[PDB]
Amino acid sequence: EGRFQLVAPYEPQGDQPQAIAKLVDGLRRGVKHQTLLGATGTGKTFTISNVIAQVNKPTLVIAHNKTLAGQLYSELKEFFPHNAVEYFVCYYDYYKINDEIDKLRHSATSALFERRDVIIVASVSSIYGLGSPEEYRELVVSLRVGMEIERNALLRRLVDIQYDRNDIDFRRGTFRVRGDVVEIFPASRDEHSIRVEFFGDEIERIREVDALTGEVLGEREHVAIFPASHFVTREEKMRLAIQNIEQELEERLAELRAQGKLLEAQRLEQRTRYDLEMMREMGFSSGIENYSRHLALRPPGSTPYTLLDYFPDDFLIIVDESHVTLPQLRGMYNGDRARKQVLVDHGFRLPSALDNRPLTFEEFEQKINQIIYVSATPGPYELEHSPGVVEQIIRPTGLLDPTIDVRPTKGQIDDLIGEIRERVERNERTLVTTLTKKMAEDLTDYLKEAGIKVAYLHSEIKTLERIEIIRDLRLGKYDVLVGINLLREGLDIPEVSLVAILDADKEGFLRSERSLIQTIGRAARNANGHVIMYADTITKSMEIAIQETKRRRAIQEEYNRKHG
DNA sequence: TCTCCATCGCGCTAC
């Protein structure tokens, strides 16, 4: 039940003090919804880190993608080195890798019950279904030295919380027994296992151990062993659960036969039986999450348990890039219901599998205690519910928001080519946005023809190779990058002095108030930052973006002359 | 009611 200790070589600067203080004040006044309107490049992760430290609550931060999530996580481990900073997302291949991520998920949920100083960076996997956090906590095996317990009953418990007996391939989520030593590999650890040495019905010693080399690392007075699955139930309840699944199965197979669908019924039966055979062995299976209703014995159509429930009631939520993350959350349920419904109709799953689902937005709302939305361009939900906004526009470095010229489309490419050439001579980079992948590739060709070092960047390119291209631009291998909608949230490249927005009047999600400001922001990390919008008209979106950027530059200039 | 891009999750379908 510890305390956050913020570790930074610097202290709040710019308008971070007023931002940190207004947020902390609102949290202490019990304000449910708050918005931090923080321009790109102002120290937002540091700002938030200060708020978290001053209210000292377990906090959940939700990001809309994992590149950002991973960045936030690495940064928050830096700022809070002696605190529990965790990561709760699911599988991806840009940071085995699959087991590393399952390990962190268990490390996240266990940390919530062990200590108070916890920060969990998460994707929308945070609103997907888990098993009861009550069952998970009460099934924890709490081991103390000189404790009256039978080696007998310890092993009974471990199996029921999903550790596999395995004397040979001793990996995480397993345990092995040699004579009087039961050795355990917690699901939250990748390197350290637990040695538990018995003498009759008494534990004589407990040792933290490097599982690979056997190097004893030290002693332990006590140790808590959490379950190796988030969908754990008591063996007591499995007997009735398997009955209720069997009953659900026959009813469903009758539905299928009464509509023909013999191929679907055979498919369903084969699969359910296999899962049932496994449930009478241990308790788990391949797709165990789909039997959550029956396993937890809960009323049908119940609200699922999520990561939010594993948090204490007085927790804080930070929504990063809220203008994008909130719409992501909102549409998850209907999409899920639809994909699951096709599986039930084709005999891949029982209808009870619909209860294994993500929260609705309404359900999510009710699980919120206190929340802070963080966006340079917050959406209508955030503004509607928050009492005004906490504006953070003075960057700590004093870097200004860029200037924005509007130029005609006629002769635009040749204008841009000329403009790029100037930047090459000043050892500066350029970013261009177009409307499609095709146009991006076509333009990249045309620039290569004109003696410009150029490469494209869009969703067809895999994440690993994107890192390379972003590095190459920085190193000066490329001078220009042409994209569509990846020159956005979280692309921090200070070598870029020019952003060129082609088809700036082609209104829609690619050219809205929100996306324009976000794109403009890529030129705010440079002291000569400049933006050019090629267009024959100034759309309502362009108007607002130019207007807001002009206000920020003027205000920032006003600050810089005052403070040297 | 479709398009443009880019993201998440899940889970079938081939290695």
Place this chain on the structure above:
DNA sequence: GGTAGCGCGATGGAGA
């Protein structure tokens, strides 16, 4: 009875 690699719905925001 092991897993990476696709395909799927929803979302922003307008045009058509």
